């Protein structure tokens, strides 16, 4: 766990459209919610690859292990069923555990993603902002709607603002 989701950023955003992670801004001229297509799409590709691997890699033969027997060959019939059952018990346990393990890793991945996004913004601003320790950054200078966009797209240059701080 990376302490972001349900962590220092203590709540989600309803009305975050077409994205898992994103930004919420507020300058003199409005608000102020947009998804981060970069990190969201990258996470979507990972979840998709995960799901596809889990399923596409199961390309063997999985129907019953059974034959036809008359009522005089009970023993061989019982062993055949016991083996089928044993094979079924192996897959059963693996399926339950894989899903538990994978759900564990999926949630933590998302946690890591929003945490790496938060750290990415923090590195951009440097001394041009105060870290409020809850996902928000208080700018020390004024930020255009064009300024906000440079912060969102990772191009924001801290040198071009140093003094108003």
């Amino acid at each position: 766990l990376f302490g972001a989701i349900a962590g220092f950023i203590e709540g989600g955003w309803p009305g975050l459209i077409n994205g898992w992670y994103g930004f919420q801004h507020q300058n003199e001229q409005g608000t102020g919610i947009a998804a981060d297509k970069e990190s969201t799409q990258k996470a979507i590709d990972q979840i998709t690859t995960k799901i596809n691997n889990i399923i596409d890699k199961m390309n063997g033969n999985y129907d019953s292990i059974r034959g036809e027997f008359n009522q005089v060959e009970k023993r061989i019939n019982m062993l055949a069923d016991r083996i089928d059952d044993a094979v079924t018990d192996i897959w059963s346990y693996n399926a339950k555990l894989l899903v538990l393990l994978e759900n564990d890793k999926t949630l933590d991945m998302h946690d890591a993603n929003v945490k790496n996004l938060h750290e990415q913004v923090r590195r951009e601003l440097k001394d041009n902002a105060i870290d409020e320790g809850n996902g928000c950054f208080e700018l020390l200078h004024k930020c255009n709607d064009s300024c906000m966009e440079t912060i969102r797209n990772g191009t924001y240059d801290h040198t071009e603002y140093a003094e108003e701080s």
Binding site: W13, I54, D63, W91, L100, L107, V121
Partner: protein, 324 residues
């Protein structure tokens, strides 16, 4: 106050919940199902290949050609078999099919099937064709198994008859023959003349000699003697010879088979249908891209693995934590 920018994540309206290794019932924004739970509830064609219903006949009666069964003359292939456990028709004449377990297994599913005439029914020599009231046909006339011919004495004499079959088909061929055990040495005399008759069946790998085991059986359908039907798979280039002087049910029709033992004999009382699936169960057809299923352990074809489990939800979204 000042200008501000915040990082955040998705929240939604869901009761959707997944279990993780460390936590039970964790809310998530989205998830998928790994286990297939839906089926047709009917017998379907399997990957383009239709099954074969046996109607009112058991597999035994079907394979020997019980006149009351529908003929298997026109069949070319089947993915699996549908059999009624309480089927009224089987071996109409009191008897047993030897090693029927193996046979059932080998005929569960066959990709290439066609009946064929091994030896001409009249090419045997001086003998008559015997019928019985136990094996009546669609009409009501006395008859016998389509695949066998009940040879009996002709003009008070039963000659030593001997024919042989050559597997020239290039594929495996199922041959069926039988031995009739009369109620007494008196009946074998009436039917075959010769005392203590015999049948000799041989290939170049094995050879069996059959003698009659007279006695009264607590049979069925009027008769009280006993028939024992045998079979053997003749391989391409192999030949089987039959020699007898009585008590012999001769091979007429055999089966040419390729890619067999690929099926299943379902005995489930569900209905047949026009659907087509890649996986058939004793409970219904399954069509899904999912790789697991918890519907029925008895399944055939390109199936998801059956597992003993409730639905398994795979998380795709993130933890659904309500808005501040």
């Amino acid at each position: 106050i000042q200008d501000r920018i915040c990082v955040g994540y998705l929240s939604t309206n869901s009761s959707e919940r997944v279990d993780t290794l460390l936590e039970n019932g964790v809310p998530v924004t989205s998830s998928i199902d790994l286990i297939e739970t839906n089926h047709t509830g009917t017998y379907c064609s399997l990957n383009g290949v239709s099954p074969v219903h046996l109607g009112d006949c058991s597999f035994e009666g079907w394979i020997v050609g019980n006149p009351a069964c529908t003929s298997n003359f026109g069949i070319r292939e089947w993915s699996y078999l549908i059999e009624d456990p309480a089927a009224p028709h089987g071996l109409c004449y009191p008897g047993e099919l030897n090693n029927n377990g193996e046979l059932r297994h080998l005929f569960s599913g066959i990709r290439s099937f066609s009946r064929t005439e091994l030896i001409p029914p009249t090419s045997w020599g001086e003998v008559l064709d015997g019928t019985t009231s136990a094996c009546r046909d669609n009409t009501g006339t006395n008859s016998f198994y389509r695949n066998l011919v009940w040879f009996i004495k002709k003009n008070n004499r039963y000659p030593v008859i001997s024919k042989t079959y050559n597997n020239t088909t290039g594929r495996d061929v199922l041959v069926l023959w039988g031995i009739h055990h009369p109620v007494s040495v008196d009946e074998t005399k009436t039917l075959y003349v010769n005392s203590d008759p015999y049948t000799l069946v041989s290939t170049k790998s094995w050879s069996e000699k059959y003698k009659l085991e007279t006695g009264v059986r607590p049979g069925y359908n009027g008769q009280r003697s006993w028939m024992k039907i045998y079979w053997s798979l003749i391989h391409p280039g192999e030949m089987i010879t039959f020699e007898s002087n009585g008590g012999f049910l001769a091979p007429r029709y055999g089966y040419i088979i390729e890619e067999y033992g690929k099926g299943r004999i379902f005995q489930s009382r569900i209905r047949m249908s026009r659907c087509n699936t890649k996986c058939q169960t004793s409970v219904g057809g399954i069509n899904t891209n999912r790789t697991f299923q918890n519907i029925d352990k008895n399944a055939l074809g390109d199936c998801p693995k059956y597992i003993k489990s409730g639905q398994l939800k795979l998380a795709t979204g993130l933890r659904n934590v309500p808005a501040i």
